[PDB]
Amino acid sequence: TDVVIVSAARTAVGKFGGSLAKIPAPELGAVVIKAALERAGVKPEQVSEVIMGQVLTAGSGQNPARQAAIKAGLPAMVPAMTINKVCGSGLKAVMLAANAIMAGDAEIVVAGGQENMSAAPHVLPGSRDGFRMGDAKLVDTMIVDGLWDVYNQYHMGITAENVAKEYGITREAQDEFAVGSQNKAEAAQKAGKFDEEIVPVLIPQRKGDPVAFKTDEFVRQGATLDSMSGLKPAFDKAGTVTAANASGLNDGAAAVVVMSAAKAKELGLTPLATIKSYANAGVDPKVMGMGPVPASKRALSRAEWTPQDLDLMEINEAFAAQALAVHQQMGWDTSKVNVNGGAIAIGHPIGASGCRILVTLLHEMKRRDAKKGLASLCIGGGMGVALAVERK
Amino acid sequence: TDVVIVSAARTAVGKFGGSLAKIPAPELGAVVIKAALERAGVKPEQVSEVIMGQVLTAGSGQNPARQAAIKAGLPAMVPAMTINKVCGSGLKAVMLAANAIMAGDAEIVVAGGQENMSAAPHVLPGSRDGFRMGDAKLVDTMIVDGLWDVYNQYHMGITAENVAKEYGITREAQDEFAVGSQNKAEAAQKAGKFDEEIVPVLIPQRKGDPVAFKTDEFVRQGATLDSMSGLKPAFDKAGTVTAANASGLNDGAAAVVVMSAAKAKELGLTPLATIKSYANAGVDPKVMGMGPVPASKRALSRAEWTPQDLDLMEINEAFAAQALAVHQQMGWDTSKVNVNGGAIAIGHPIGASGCRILVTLLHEMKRRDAKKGLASLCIGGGMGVALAVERK
Amino acid sequence: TDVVIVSAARTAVGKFGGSLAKIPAPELGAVVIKAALERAGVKPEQVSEVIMGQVLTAGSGQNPARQAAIKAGLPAMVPAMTINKVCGSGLKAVMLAANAIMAGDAEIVVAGGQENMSAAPHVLPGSRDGFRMGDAKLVDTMIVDGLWDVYNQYHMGITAENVAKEYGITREAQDEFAVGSQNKAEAAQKAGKFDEEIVPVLIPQRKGDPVAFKTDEFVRQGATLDSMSGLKPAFDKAGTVTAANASGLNDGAAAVVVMSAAKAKELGLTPLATIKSYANAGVDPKVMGMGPVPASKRALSRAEWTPQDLDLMEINEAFAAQALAVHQQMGWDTSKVNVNGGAIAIGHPIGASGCRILVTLLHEMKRRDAKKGLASLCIGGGMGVALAVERK
Amino acid sequence: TDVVIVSAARTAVGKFGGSLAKIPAPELGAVVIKAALERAGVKPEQVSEVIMGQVLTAGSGQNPARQAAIKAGLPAMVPAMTINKVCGSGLKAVMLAANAIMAGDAEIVVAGGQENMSAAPHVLPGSRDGFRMGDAKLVDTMIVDGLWDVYNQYHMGITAENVAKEYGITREAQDEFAVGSQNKAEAAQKAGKFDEEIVPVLIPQRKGDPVAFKTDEFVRQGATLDSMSGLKPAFDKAGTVTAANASGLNDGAAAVVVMSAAKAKELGLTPLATIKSYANAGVDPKVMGMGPVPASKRALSRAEWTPQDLDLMEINEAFAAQALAVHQQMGWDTSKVNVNGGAIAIGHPIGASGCRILVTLLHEMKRRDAKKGLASLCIGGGMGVALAVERK
């Protein structure tokens, strides 16, 4: 069974504390689910299943993905499920949709991710037992559930330093990479390249009608090497990783509609692309930033493609240090990677990024008529995911 | 190709604040992952993927499934994913495993769930922005994320009252049903029926050795109707649901090892059962308790079986009110259902239950040489999942 | 013994979350203690005791008055004590200083108060027992310790509505009074009338050297009746008290140096004034705002003065509703009251306000050579304090 | 004019988390304020003022002394003020009362202290501004506000180790002192020596009438040297201070009624004693335990008494280490000091201890017909207070 992607939509990515800060992750998920379905020409009642990635769910309520589906106007008859494979979540959702379609378990699946990093709360562990004596800890759920390695008990930013050391990725190289990402996202924005893929979110106002938010507000305009080389290291005073060469903390959602090629044909729909292959992989948690290498190799092996066969790629930029090490290990043409900027510039709403880069990939493939594409992400805890698509 | 279950294991279920209260959920998952693989005779490095359900993840750290996999002895190369379909999680994990094998995405998958309801913490919504003037609320994550309907803003116990009203399930029938569950679990404990299934959890002590926890401590021996019929309703003063005719808040884990029948043959393993079919379904959130009906009907339809074909069933008993309405609607022989007792007696660790009842089902099927089996549960937010198994 | 006041100093009053918000209260106290002594020409070593009012002390550390004394450069041999009589605290400090000198217990006392309302934290009641299930409350210490009536369980602003209703103080009359207060404080600032009394506080900046904070930043310039009539009622939706006709929440400190007439004469110091009399009183908590009526009458009876003998008064403006009711009951000449503006315009750092208005009264008495003055304040929980001063 | 003490009452001292744990400090204060008035034969209406010490007031509500007075049945016309001189507070309250009376500001004053250490909550500093990113600390108010030196940032415990070093107070001398305090308290308990002074507190019961709490429950009966001499140092691993040779964390309240001798004669009342003198003193915070030395010397000089004139003394036992250093420097007869034991055994409710030891002193003086007595305590932050009393 061939699986196709018939539509793709994303929100603009919000700055930390920015335009999307007050909009719960399921509400952002609902925007994209509703829009993806309208773009596909698929009625909500024809949907078999919704699968949404969301990593930060403390106090979010029962099954965020169901909440998104119901807010999108899908009937109660359509079941949904929430998944968490850290940054891989939103791409893993598409893989699960594909597995389900191939197995005959589902016909039409909406798959993506949703995240509001702004709104994540603090948690009080042991609050049931009480605190008999001395000071106690209110823990940042964004950090502990999203950005902290369990096995080594340090920040993701330290894994990035481990990678920069292991693979010889200098500060200067990372900064040059980050300026490239800002510069590409700025040119893409100015050329109108995100216009089609972005679906507006209506932001309620104190007085008057709500206002659409529809622009990637985290992108820096006129970014230069100098504005970066002055910064100090964020995670280790002898380190290379700064706020400027790492992605941000952000808010957003993305979704695609997936179905069998036969279902699309039955419905008269023209696919955007066919799912060619996908894979996951695991690596040591200390170097999680390298997960895309074994995952992309496996996805490419399953597709029967070489890295040279690829026309375009979206490799998520959690840290310039790992993105460079990935490109070094893969050996592919870096001029075809993240051609409209990456997460350093656009932002990184963790559970949504996997699907956000796929949505960006698909829209650029059509614009330049590229045929073979790949999306891949690293994953905290030492994993990678990758997914290959082909256009006729 | 078809998908087989080669082994199955569960912890005993703990009471709220009871023997497992200090063992974090991924540690409980590690116990059953490790035991399932040992029982199957499968080496850690041969596993393709781990899928664990866990609903309450506030401050649990990055990707609880991965945490469980690593704690179990699985090498870094084995990727893992956490899912949340509320009570359906544990069984949906097995279904996702099956889709993956049938799609050729994975060969050997460990699937199940884990939950520690005792250790679920409070969180502080809005802590990020601050509380400029006025009091602030700590919210209980166990209630909000585990037991509270989003759409209707009430407890799961009110959905159970809605179902009792709609289907005419009386207080006396609920109590009689609850007593039956207790008395069956009692008989099973006395007869050693859980001895094979259960994997001990070693509980550290102030001093001395660790103590092995290996009995379902929630079970009430000597239960009688007179012990139940005087209780006051728990959720609505004019209602029918009590703490004696509903399950509890509980801790535990369960897992199975799933692979293709071809892979099992290559490895010389004899499966416990073949996965015959499975299905999800959505219903109104108000009557979420009824999810097993259209899920089990769809699973049966896919198996080409009638309800009368079944030899044994496990249907989760979140509330006697819903379990009884399910049996009323399915028409099946209730002397074949939950023969060793159900959740009312054993307990209900929410993310684990789905796989726990599967473990119990498989082990009893072997003892009775039952050929056709079905497990199903209801899901907060208005869903069901059902999975059918067949033994030669 | 005659007790004389030899010097007097205060900070500018900061806005809520404003220029002082990050300067803890004992550091604000240390500024005014140090400066009062310098203005008096009294060395730190000669001080017998420091008495500082501070109301909100949650997590402030041991004995905030001692912390002020030490940060001001006083030697460890100078003992100190903190007190709390809500808004009366900073004036009550002076009264206790006077009692001590009269009794022979002390020779030189620095008295006043200090308060940082911006920095008051939230508290977690019952944090040692834990919260077995459901929501728990983080309580605002500023509201509960500073602004909430214990006996009636409602805000101080409700006591102000009670007073407005009992004495027939209209919204329009409160708004006219508020305009008066803003306009007098504005005139006084433009005329340099606070120049002598205010001591600078140095505020650290992200760039460059500290900048002196030295102006009453809460004062609304150009206020008219129209700027008041647009606010809505702040505490009772059907009431008359708004943010604009009530004092604000503020930060600041004030202190005076007190000693016997003989001691001043021996030291060659010319006093600012002699303490004539003082008094406290108690009223029903429901109408605490009327506290200054029985306190002022008692202080006047002990002075052998009538209200018409006064040349100048400072009657703290907690709420226009109560300040008007007090003027109505005393029948004194309102043109002689708060001639440089009141707390509605300048702000109300609760534990410092009593000494703040005293410092303001003294400097204005000196400027126009008024001979008889009175300071009085109402106190949460149903009290008043008053203190009379006489200049040669 | 001279000032007399006409009555004295205390609660029994509660152990941490024991009998008084649920009774808020002002309810404890109310018990002793009411009883001290009934003992004195003074009508509540005739009281000029209430002064209560209370150190831990986070979330206690507006002006805990006023709350005590109101719960004691005193009318709204009687004003009240709360003070904080750490452990000095309850005796300093009596000193302020004496100052008031001598200055003619008051006629009749109820003075003492109240503390519930058990119920002291955790605070969340910075809660108003929020926690943009990162973990936040819940601070224990009992430690920070009660037990931690501000200047040196360490426990009162370390100040005791400083004292032991400076004055050569060994671990063996500390433990002997502690066993002596325990044994004397036990003897006094058995002999009925606290029966008159103690007022019962009614503890509400889950069913039935309340149960009186009337005994000093922290006192260890059958205490022996072997029970202390194997304990590990509590604060410094090369130190001498243990949990057995320091006081505990305790709950209770104490109050006396103070008036002029003239007022007492007019009312026909026989005083317990005359206040002979009092004094405060400041020392370096590092050795705050030595406070009673300069304070008791100054009080004795003001009385024109020598240490050898004293018939009985109560010197608060915060730590054996400082109590022994005080005895060494004063030169007095230790057989006349804490004759019924001290705080090591009875306990140390910080804000109430100062008046607690005074109440104890006065009752024992009457039984022995002692003529000259002194009460003194050390104060965190480097202070001492002392008060001398004489009987005809």
mmCIF file with all atom_site columns, N, CA, C and O in Angstrom, chain B residues 26-57:
data_model
loop_
_atom_site.group_PDB
_atom_site.id
_atom_site.type_symbol
_atom_site.label_atom_id
_atom_site.label_alt_id
_atom_site.label_comp_id
_atom_site.label_asym_id
_atom_site.label_entity_id
_atom_site.label_seq_id
_atom_site.pdbx_PDB_ins_code
_atom_site.Cartn_x
_atom_site.Cartn_y
_atom_site.Cartn_z
_atom_site.occupancy
_atom_site.B_iso_or_equiv
_atom_site.pdbx_formal_charge
_atom_site.auth_seq_id
_atom_site.auth_comp_id
_atom_site.auth_asym_id
_atom_site.auth_atom_id
_atom_site.pdbx_PDB_model_num
ATOM 1   N N  . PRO B 1 26 ? 8.258  4.934   34.981 1.00 0.00 ? 26 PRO B N  1
ATOM 2   C CA . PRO B 1 26 ? 9.166  4.232   34.050 1.00 0.00 ? 26 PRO B CA 1
ATOM 3   C C  . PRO B 1 26 ? 9.937  3.032   34.717 1.00 0.00 ? 26 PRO B C  1
ATOM 4   O O  . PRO B 1 26 ? 10.289 2.096   34.030 1.00 0.00 ? 26 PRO B O  1
ATOM 5   N N  . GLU B 1 27 ? 10.150 3.058   36.043 1.00 0.00 ? 27 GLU B N  1
ATOM 6   C CA . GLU B 1 27 ? 10.762 1.937   36.783 1.00 0.00 ? 27 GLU B CA 1
ATOM 7   C C  . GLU B 1 27 ? 9.839  0.745   36.837 1.00 0.00 ? 27 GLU B C  1
ATOM 8   O O  . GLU B 1 27 ? 10.262 -0.416  36.802 1.00 0.00 ? 27 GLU B O  1
ATOM 9   N N  . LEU B 1 28 ? 8.558  1.011   36.932 1.00 0.00 ? 28 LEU B N  1
ATOM 10  C CA . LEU B 1 28 ? 7.561  -0.085  36.861 1.00 0.00 ? 28 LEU B CA 1
ATOM 11  C C  . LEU B 1 28 ? 7.461  -0.705  35.461 1.00 0.00 ? 28 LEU B C  1
ATOM 12  O O  . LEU B 1 28 ? 7.330  -1.950  35.254 1.00 0.00 ? 28 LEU B O  1
ATOM 13  N N  . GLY B 1 29 ? 7.556  0.172   34.467 1.00 0.00 ? 29 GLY B N  1
ATOM 14  C CA . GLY B 1 29 ? 7.611  -0.246  33.079 1.00 0.00 ? 29 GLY B CA 1
ATOM 15  C C  . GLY B 1 29 ? 8.873  -1.056  32.840 1.00 0.00 ? 29 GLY B C  1
ATOM 16  O O  . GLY B 1 29 ? 8.844  -1.982  32.105 1.00 0.00 ? 29 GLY B O  1
ATOM 17  N N  . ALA B 1 30 ? 9.972  -0.703  33.465 1.00 0.00 ? 30 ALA B N  1
ATOM 18  C CA . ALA B 1 30 ? 11.238 -1.425  33.204 1.00 0.00 ? 30 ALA B CA 1
ATOM 19  C C  . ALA B 1 30 ? 11.158 -2.854  33.675 1.00 0.00 ? 30 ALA B C  1
ATOM 20  O O  . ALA B 1 30 ? 11.593 -3.785  32.972 1.00 0.00 ? 30 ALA B O  1
ATOM 21  N N  . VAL B 1 31 ? 10.517 -3.021  34.840 1.00 0.00 ? 31 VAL B N  1
ATOM 22  C CA . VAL B 1 31 ? 10.271 -4.363  35.399 1.00 0.00 ? 31 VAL B CA 1
ATOM 23  C C  . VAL B 1 31 ? 9.573  -5.266  34.396 1.00 0.00 ? 31 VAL B C  1
ATOM 24  O O  . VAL B 1 31 ? 10.015 -6.397  34.110 1.00 0.00 ? 31 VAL B O  1
ATOM 25  N N  . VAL B 1 32 ? 8.442  -4.807  33.852 1.00 0.00 ? 32 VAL B N  1
ATOM 26  C CA . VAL B 1 32 ? 7.663  -5.650  32.932 1.00 0.00 ? 32 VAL B CA 1
ATOM 27  C C  . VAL B 1 32 ? 8.243  -5.771  31.532 1.00 0.00 ? 32 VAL B C  1
ATOM 28  O O  . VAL B 1 32 ? 8.106  -6.784  30.905 1.00 0.00 ? 32 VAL B O  1
ATOM 29  N N  . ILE B 1 33 ? 8.957  -4.760  31.060 1.00 0.00 ? 33 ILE B N  1
ATOM 30  C CA . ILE B 1 33 ? 9.684  -4.889  29.800 1.00 0.00 ? 33 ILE B CA 1
ATOM 31  C C  . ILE B 1 33 ? 10.739 -5.999  29.929 1.00 0.00 ? 33 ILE B C  1
ATOM 32  O O  . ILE B 1 33 ? 10.858 -6.859  29.107 1.00 0.00 ? 33 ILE B O  1
ATOM 33  N N  . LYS B 1 34 ? 11.553 -5.901  30.961 1.00 0.00 ? 34 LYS B N  1
ATOM 34  C CA . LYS B 1 34 ? 12.609 -6.848  31.157 1.00 0.00 ? 34 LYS B CA 1
ATOM 35  C C  . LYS B 1 34 ? 12.076 -8.284  31.314 1.00 0.00 ? 34 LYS B C  1
ATOM 36  O O  . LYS B 1 34 ? 12.500 -9.188  30.610 1.00 0.00 ? 34 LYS B O  1
ATOM 37  N N  . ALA B 1 35 ? 11.062 -8.469  32.143 1.00 0.00 ? 35 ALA B N  1
ATOM 38  C CA . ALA B 1 35 ? 10.456 -9.798  32.344 1.00 0.00 ? 35 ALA B CA 1
ATOM 39  C C  . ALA B 1 35 ? 9.802  -10.334 31.084 1.00 0.00 ? 35 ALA B C  1
ATOM 40  O O  . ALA B 1 35 ? 9.989  -11.499 30.798 1.00 0.00 ? 35 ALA B O  1
ATOM 41  N N  . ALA B 1 36 ? 9.057  -9.490  30.323 1.00 0.00 ? 36 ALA B N  1
ATOM 42  C CA . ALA B 1 36 ? 8.441  -9.996  29.051 1.00 0.00 ? 36 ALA B CA 1
ATOM 43  C C  . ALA B 1 36 ? 9.466  -10.539 28.063 1.00 0.00 ? 36 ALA B C  1
ATOM 44  O O  . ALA B 1 36 ? 9.253  -11.562 27.439 1.00 0.00 ? 36 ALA B O  1
ATOM 45  N N  . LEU B 1 37 ? 10.585 -9.828  27.943 1.00 0.00 ? 37 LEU B N  1
ATOM 46  C CA . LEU B 1 37 ? 11.633 -10.215 27.028 1.00 0.00 ? 37 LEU B CA 1
ATOM 47  C C  . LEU B 1 37 ? 12.292 -11.504 27.529 1.00 0.00 ? 37 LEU B C  1
ATOM 48  O O  . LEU B 1 37 ? 12.528 -12.381 26.716 1.00 0.00 ? 37 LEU B O  1
ATOM 49  N N  . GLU B 1 38 ? 12.581 -11.607 28.821 1.00 0.00 ? 38 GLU B N  1
ATOM 50  C CA . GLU B 1 38 ? 13.117 -12.880 29.408 1.00 0.00 ? 38 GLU B CA 1
ATOM 51  C C  . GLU B 1 38 ? 12.210 -14.040 29.203 1.00 0.00 ? 38 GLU B C  1
ATOM 52  O O  . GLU B 1 38 ? 12.613 -15.168 28.836 1.00 0.00 ? 38 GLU B O  1
ATOM 53  N N  . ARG B 1 39 ? 10.928 -13.805 29.425 1.00 0.00 ? 39 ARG B N  1
ATOM 54  C CA . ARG B 1 39 ? 9.992  -14.903 29.246 1.00 0.00 ? 39 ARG B CA 1
ATOM 55  C C  . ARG B 1 39 ? 9.870  -15.343 27.822 1.00 0.00 ? 39 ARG B C  1
ATOM 56  O O  . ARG B 1 39 ? 9.488  -16.467 27.541 1.00 0.00 ? 39 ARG B O  1
ATOM 57  N N  . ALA B 1 40 ? 10.089 -14.425 26.901 1.00 0.00 ? 40 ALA B N  1
ATOM 58  C CA . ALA B 1 40 ? 9.931  -14.676 25.503 1.00 0.00 ? 40 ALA B CA 1
ATOM 59  C C  . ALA B 1 40 ? 11.204 -15.361 25.028 1.00 0.00 ? 40 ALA B C  1
ATOM 60  O O  . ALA B 1 40 ? 11.186 -16.003 23.996 1.00 0.00 ? 40 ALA B O  1
ATOM 61  N N  . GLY B 1 41 ? 12.323 -15.130 25.715 1.00 0.00 ? 41 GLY B N  1
ATOM 62  C CA . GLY B 1 41 ? 13.641 -15.546 25.250 1.00 0.00 ? 41 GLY B CA 1
ATOM 63  C C  . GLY B 1 41 ? 14.262 -14.634 24.209 1.00 0.00 ? 41 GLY B C  1
ATOM 64  O O  . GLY B 1 41 ? 15.012 -15.095 23.376 1.00 0.00 ? 41 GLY B O  1
ATOM 65  N N  . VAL B 1 42 ? 13.955 -13.337 24.272 1.00 0.00 ? 42 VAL B N  1
ATOM 66  C CA . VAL B 1 42 ? 14.348 -12.375 23.258 1.00 0.00 ? 42 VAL B CA 1
ATOM 67  C C  . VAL B 1 42 ? 15.433 -11.525 23.863 1.00 0.00 ? 42 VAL B C  1
ATOM 68  O O  . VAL B 1 42 ? 15.243 -10.985 24.928 1.00 0.00 ? 42 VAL B O  1
ATOM 69  N N  . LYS B 1 43 ? 16.547 -11.389 23.179 1.00 0.00 ? 43 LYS B N  1
ATOM 70  C CA . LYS B 1 43 ? 17.639 -10.551 23.666 1.00 0.00 ? 43 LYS B CA 1
ATOM 71  C C  . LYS B 1 43 ? 17.328 -9.068  23.429 1.00 0.00 ? 43 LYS B C  1
ATOM 72  O O  . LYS B 1 43 ? 16.784 -8.702  22.378 1.00 0.00 ? 43 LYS B O  1
ATOM 73  N N  . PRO B 1 44 ? 17.683 -8.210  24.392 1.00 0.00 ? 44 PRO B N  1
ATOM 74  C CA . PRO B 1 44 ? 17.447 -6.770  24.302 1.00 0.00 ? 44 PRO B CA 1
ATOM 75  C C  . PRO B 1 44 ? 17.803 -6.138  22.937 1.00 0.00 ? 44 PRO B C  1
ATOM 76  O O  . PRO B 1 44 ? 16.988 -5.376  22.360 1.00 0.00 ? 44 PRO B O  1
ATOM 77  N N  . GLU B 1 45 ? 18.998 -6.450  22.433 1.00 0.00 ? 45 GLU B N  1
ATOM 78  C CA . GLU B 1 45 ? 19.458 -5.924  21.144 1.00 0.00 ? 45 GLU B CA 1
ATOM 79  C C  . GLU B 1 45 ? 18.627 -6.297  19.915 1.00 0.00 ? 45 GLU B C  1
ATOM 80  O O  . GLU B 1 45 ? 18.751 -5.647  18.870 1.00 0.00 ? 45 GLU B O  1
ATOM 81  N N  . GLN B 1 46 ? 17.760 -7.302  20.047 1.00 0.00 ? 46 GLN B N  1
ATOM 82  C CA . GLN B 1 46 ? 16.882 -7.724  18.963 1.00 0.00 ? 46 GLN B CA 1
ATOM 83  C C  . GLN B 1 46 ? 15.563 -6.918  18.903 1.00 0.00 ? 46 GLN B C  1
ATOM 84  O O  . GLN B 1 46 ? 14.809 -7.056  17.962 1.00 0.00 ? 46 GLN B O  1
ATOM 85  N N  . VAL B 1 47 ? 15.286 -6.113  19.909 1.00 0.00 ? 47 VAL B N  1
ATOM 86  C CA . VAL B 1 47 ? 14.018 -5.370  19.926 1.00 0.00 ? 47 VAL B CA 1
ATOM 87  C C  . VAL B 1 47 ? 14.076 -4.194  18.928 1.00 0.00 ? 47 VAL B C  1
ATOM 88  O O  . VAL B 1 47 ? 15.068 -3.445  18.860 1.00 0.00 ? 47 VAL B O  1
ATOM 89  N N  . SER B 1 48 ? 13.020 -3.975  18.167 1.00 0.00 ? 48 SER B N  1
ATOM 90  C CA . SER B 1 48 ? 12.989 -2.852  17.225 1.00 0.00 ? 48 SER B CA 1
ATOM 91  C C  . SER B 1 48 ? 12.529 -1.551  17.852 1.00 0.00 ? 48 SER B C  1
ATOM 92  O O  . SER B 1 48 ? 12.996 -0.494  17.464 1.00 0.00 ? 48 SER B O  1
ATOM 93  N N  . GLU B 1 49 ? 11.599 -1.620  18.788 1.00 0.00 ? 49 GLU B N  1
ATOM 94  C CA . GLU B 1 49 ? 10.943 -0.444  19.326 1.00 0.00 ? 49 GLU B CA 1
ATOM 95  C C  . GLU B 1 49 ? 10.252 -0.811  20.615 1.00 0.00 ? 49 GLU B C  1
ATOM 96  O O  . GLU B 1 49 ? 9.828  -1.920  20.735 1.00 0.00 ? 49 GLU B O  1
ATOM 97  N N  . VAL B 1 50 ? 10.164 0.130   21.528 1.00 0.00 ? 50 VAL B N  1
ATOM 98  C CA . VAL B 1 50 ? 9.339  0.085   22.744 1.00 0.00 ? 50 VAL B CA 1
ATOM 99  C C  . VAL B 1 50 ? 8.245  1.182   22.651 1.00 0.00 ? 50 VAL B C  1
ATOM 100 O O  . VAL B 1 50 ? 8.507  2.328   22.334 1.00 0.00 ? 50 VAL B O  1
ATOM 101 N N  . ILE B 1 51 ? 7.025  0.794   22.869 1.00 0.00 ? 51 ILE B N  1
ATOM 102 C CA . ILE B 1 51 ? 5.863  1.706   22.926 1.00 0.00 ? 51 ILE B CA 1
ATOM 103 C C  . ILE B 1 51 ? 5.174  1.530   24.280 1.00 0.00 ? 51 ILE B C  1
ATOM 104 O O  . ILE B 1 51 ? 4.661  0.461   24.574 1.00 0.00 ? 51 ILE B O  1
ATOM 105 N N  . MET B 1 52 ? 5.187  2.552   25.135 1.00 0.00 ? 52 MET B N  1
ATOM 106 C CA . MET B 1 52 ? 4.520  2.461   26.408 1.00 0.00 ? 52 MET B CA 1
ATOM 107 C C  . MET B 1 52 ? 3.539  3.561   26.555 1.00 0.00 ? 52 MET B C  1
ATOM 108 O O  . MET B 1 52 ? 3.823  4.742   26.295 1.00 0.00 ? 52 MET B O  1
ATOM 109 N N  . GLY B 1 53 ? 2.365  3.177   27.038 1.00 0.00 ? 53 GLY B N  1
ATOM 110 C CA . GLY B 1 53 ? 1.459  4.200   27.448 1.00 0.00 ? 53 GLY B CA 1
ATOM 111 C C  . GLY B 1 53 ? 1.765  4.726   28.818 1.00 0.00 ? 53 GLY B C  1
ATOM 112 O O  . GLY B 1 53 ? 2.153  3.977   29.728 1.00 0.00 ? 53 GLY B O  1
ATOM 113 N N  . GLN B 1 54 ? 1.607  6.030   28.992 1.00 0.00 ? 54 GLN B N  1
ATOM 114 C CA . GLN B 1 54 ? 1.659  6.686   30.329 1.00 0.00 ? 54 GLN B CA 1
ATOM 115 C C  . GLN B 1 54 ? 0.872  7.968   30.255 1.00 0.00 ? 54 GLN B C  1
ATOM 116 O O  . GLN B 1 54 ? 1.165  8.813   29.413 1.00 0.00 ? 54 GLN B O  1
ATOM 117 N N  . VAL B 1 55 ? -0.132 8.131   31.105 1.00 0.00 ? 55 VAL B N  1
ATOM 118 C CA . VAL B 1 55 ? -1.019 9.282   30.978 1.00 0.00 ? 55 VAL B CA 1
ATOM 119 C C  . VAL B 1 55 ? -0.499 10.453  31.818 1.00 0.00 ? 55 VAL B C  1
ATOM 120 O O  . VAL B 1 55 ? -0.478 11.623  31.387 1.00 0.00 ? 55 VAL B O  1
ATOM 121 N N  . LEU B 1 56 ? 0.010  10.156  33.000 1.00 0.00 ? 56 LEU B N  1
ATOM 122 C CA . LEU B 1 56 ? 0.393  11.236  33.955 1.00 0.00 ? 56 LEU B CA 1
ATOM 123 C C  . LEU B 1 56 ? 1.891  11.412  33.937 1.00 0.00 ? 56 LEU B C  1
ATOM 124 O O  . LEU B 1 56 ? 2.601  10.647  34.591 1.00 0.00 ? 56 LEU B O  1
ATOM 125 N N  . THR B 1 57 ? 2.324  12.439  33.244 1.00 0.00 ? 57 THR B N  1
ATOM 126 C CA . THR B 1 57 ? 3.736  12.637  32.921 1.00 0.00 ? 57 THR B CA 1
ATOM 127 C C  . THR B 1 57 ? 4.334  13.960  33.419 1.00 0.00 ? 57 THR B C  1
ATOM 128 O O  . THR B 1 57 ? 5.513  14.321  33.029 1.00 0.00 ? 57 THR B O  1
#
